[PDB]
C-alpha cells in the first residue's frame, strides 16, 4: 500500500536536507510507514550522519506525505571529493486483520541514497558516465569508472539492442574504481547504466588496442 | 528534488503492491486440527501480488527482459531450523509455506525468485498452505493464527 516516489535518491551536499514523497495507495485502510537509513554495508544507522524523519508515521487511506532526509554536523567527516553510499528504507505496517487464520504481506522498499558533496555538485542533465573506460581482459572486460560518482552498469553488448536487453549481472562501480565482467569480445561495445532519474541510457564505445572509450 | 521538481525528465518509480484484500491478507478459513496433526496440508491459497506504478520489465520482465534491476526477497520469523516455514502467532502449532515457481520461498532474506510474474500481466503469483509446524513437539492445537511476511524490493 505504501510507496516511494523514486528508485534512487541523490542528496545534494550543498543543502542541509531534502524530502521524499511517500503515498498510501490503498483507498480503504490506514497504513503505518517506517523510514530509516543504512550505511554502505546496509547496516541501520540511527545517529547520523544522515537522518530520516519521522521514523514512523500513519497514512490515512489515499494520503500523501513525506519523509525528510537531513544531516548532522558530522556529515562533514565524509570525503568531499567523491560520493558516499547510503540506503533509504521505507517499510509499511499493515493494519491488524479482521479475519482469524490469515497471512499478511508488508512491502519494504530499499533504494540507493547517494551523498553528493558540494564540491562535485552536478548540473541538471550532466553526463559523467561517458567517462567510463573499457579494458579488454581475458574472458571479458574491466570496466573503469574514473569519476567521483557511483555508476550502476546494467548492460554490455556488441549492439545497442544487446546492451539493453541482453543477459547481464548488474554491477555498481564505486567512485574511482573498476570491476571485471565476463563477456564476449565486441569490436563495437555498447554499455548501459542507470542515471539519477532512473533512466537507462546507452553509451557507444570505440576500441583502440585493448582500451575502449566512448565515442565523441 | 525528484517529486517536488517538475520538467520533461521522467523519473521512474519503485513498485507499489496490492492484493484482492484491503489488508493485504489471505484467509485460510477454519482448518481441521486432526487433519493438520496427522501431517495434513491445507488447500493452496493463491497469494497474488499486483505491482503498480512501476515498469514490470524487471520482474522476470514483461514481454521478455533477462536482466535484473530489482532484487526480490521475503523475510519473516521462521521455524527453528526451517527457513522455508513462516512461524505463526496464536500458539496453534501451525506454520506457513509459500511456493513460487515450483520452489519454496525462504524467509531469511536470501534473494527470492523475481520470476513469478504471470506472463502477460503485472501480478506475481505465489501459493500458500498451512501445516503442522515442523518443530520438535509442535502439536497442532486449535485457535486462530496469523503471520506477517515482509516482501522486500531493493533497487539497483
Numbering used by the authors:
A (entry chain A): 1 to 216
B (entry chain B): 8 to 163
Question: What did the published study say regarding this structure?
Answer:
The P pilus, produced in uropathogenic Escherichia coli, displays the adhesin PapG responsible for targeting the bacterium to the kidney epithelium. The PapA rod is formed by more than 1,000 PapA molecules assembled in a right-handed helical manner, with 3.3 molecules per turn. In a process called donor–strand complementation (DSC), the G1 β-strand of PapD inserts a conserved motif of three alternating hydrophobic residues (called the P1 to P3 residues) plus N101 (P4 residue) into four binding pockets in the hydrophobic groove of the pilus subunits (P1 to P4 binding pockets).
In order to investigate the PapD/PapA and PapA/PapA interactions within the P pilus rod, the first structure which we solved was that of PapD/PapA, where two mutations were introduced in the papA gene. This was necessary because PapA in purified wild-type PapD/PapA complexes tends to spontaneously polymerize, and self-polymerization of PapA has prevented structural studies. Thus, in addition to the G15N mutation, a mutant where residues 2 to 8 were deleted was next constructed. The deleted region is just N-terminal to the DSE region of the Nte of PapA. This mutant (PapANtd1_G15N) did not undergo spontaneous polymerization, and formed a stable complex with PapD. Crystals of PapD/PapANtd1_G15N diffracted to a resolution of 2.6 Å, and the structure was solved by molecular replacement using the PapD/PapK structure as a search model. This structure is very similar to the already known PapD/PapK, PapD/PapENtd, or PapD/PapHNtd1 structures. Like PapK, PapE, or PapH, PapA lacks strand G of its Ig-fold; PapD complements this by donating its G1 strand.
